[PDB]
């Protein structure tokens, strides 16, 4: 029956495929994104798109339009977003989608209604003549949504901006099997073959959902959150890091997710705070998403007054893992200007 698992495997395959582009960029830096924060921003944009440039977006997101009608992908998203913003009684998870439009704009009243309904989006009128005030007002939305975790999403806002599409996601949940703080003890982490970093390492000796796949050449750890979330860790055999990355595939994830068999083990894993702050333009480029970022761009779904194009696609995410759980937040920023 349901729609989210009509789009899920497509999401998943996108993420990985996005990942591999980020990982091809630097081998030396932490990566952290929200594949959902990104992906939904480009689909409610795609509502406002036509022809080539529309097709690349949807296609670019690992959707195969012959096999699935356009109209169902958005019904799918409408479902995904409903289901994420349900009240898990123990876990707190929130997404939100916003439009910020210049006063002067007259929109295609359908496009507006579409985003309001399907992607439950919020619409604000601003004056992009007061660049610093508009910058402020956007960054507050994301601050208010991400509950203070993402504060400077938009650093450089363009003077001639006609609209901004912003979305957020906020996660805070607890382990089921939490770490006892008294055990967290500083050890070595071996970044590079020549770089060695001392880290506070959380420790438990217990019955974990762990296993090792010769396939992936990895260890695999599944950590439940209290509630309808789960964290999955993959520790590659020495030399097999890049292997691990290429082997990743949705269905392999689903296999793990059906296993609930516990092994006893001695588990040491770090406590974490990182971020990732990306200008996606070049990355999405390799994924075949160009034309929206060109003067070939059709956004006549949005407004008829002028030919728009997309100027900036800038995403940011922040991870914090400790002994009691994790709080993570991401946001996607898309700005559109005239030719």
């Amino acid at each position: 029956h349901p729609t989210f698992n009509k789009i899920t495997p497509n999401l998943a395959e996108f993420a990985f495929s996005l990942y591999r582009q980020l990982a091809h960029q630097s081998n030396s830096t932490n990566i952290f994104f929200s594949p959902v924060s990104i992906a939904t921003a480009f689909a409610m944009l795609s509502l406002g798109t036509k022809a080539d440039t529309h097709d690349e977006i949807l296609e670019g997101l690992n959707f195969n339009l012959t096999e699935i009608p356009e109209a169902q992908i958005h019904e799918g998203f409408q479902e995904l977003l409903r289901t994420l913003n349900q009240p898990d009684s123990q876990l707190q998870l929130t997404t939100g989608n916003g439009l910020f439009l210049s006063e002067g704009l007259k929109l295609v009243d359908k496009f507006l209604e579409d985003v309001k309904k399907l992607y439950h989006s919020e619409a604000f009128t601003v004056n992009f003549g007061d660049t610093e005030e508009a910058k402020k007002q956007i960054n507050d939305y994301v601050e208010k949504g991400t509950q203070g975790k993402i504060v400077d999403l938009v650093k450089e806002l363009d003077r001639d901006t006609v609209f901004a599409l912003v979305n957020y996601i906020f996660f805070k949940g607890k382990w089921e099997r939490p770490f006892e703080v008294k055990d967290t003890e500083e050890e070595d982490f071996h970044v590079d073959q020549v770089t060695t970093v001392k880290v506070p390492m959380m420790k438990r000796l217990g019955m974990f959902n762990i296993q090792h796949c010769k396939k992936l050449s990895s260890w695999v750890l599944l950590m439940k959150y209290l509630g309808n979330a789960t964290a999955i860790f993959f520790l590659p055999d020495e030399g097999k890091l890049q292997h691990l990355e290429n082997e990743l595939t949705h269905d392999i994830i689903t296999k793990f997710l059906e296993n609930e068999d516990r092994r006893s083990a001695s588990l040491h894993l770090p406590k974490l705070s990182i971020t990732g702050t990306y200008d996606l333009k070049s990355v999405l480029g390799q994924l075949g998403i160009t034309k929206v970022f060109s003067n070939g761009a059709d956004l006549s779904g949005v407004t008829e007054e002028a030919p728009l194009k997309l100027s900036k696609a800038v995403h940011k995410a922040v991870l914090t893992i400790d002994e009691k759980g994790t709080e993570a937040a991401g946001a996607m920023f898309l700005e559109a200007i005239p030719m």
Partner: protein
């Protein structure tokens, strides 16, 4: 060692998943946990 010791003391990949939908919330790679 028994039970066997699984130390994440080197670059690992991870990701977060919503159960009902099995949709990929966040994905990450930790190369250095002091690089913020």
């Amino acid at each position: 060692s028994i039970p066997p010791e699984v130390k994440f003391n080197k670059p690992f990949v991870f990701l977060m998943i919503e159960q009902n939908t099995k949709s990929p919330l966040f994905m990450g790679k930790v190369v250095n946990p002091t690089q913020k």
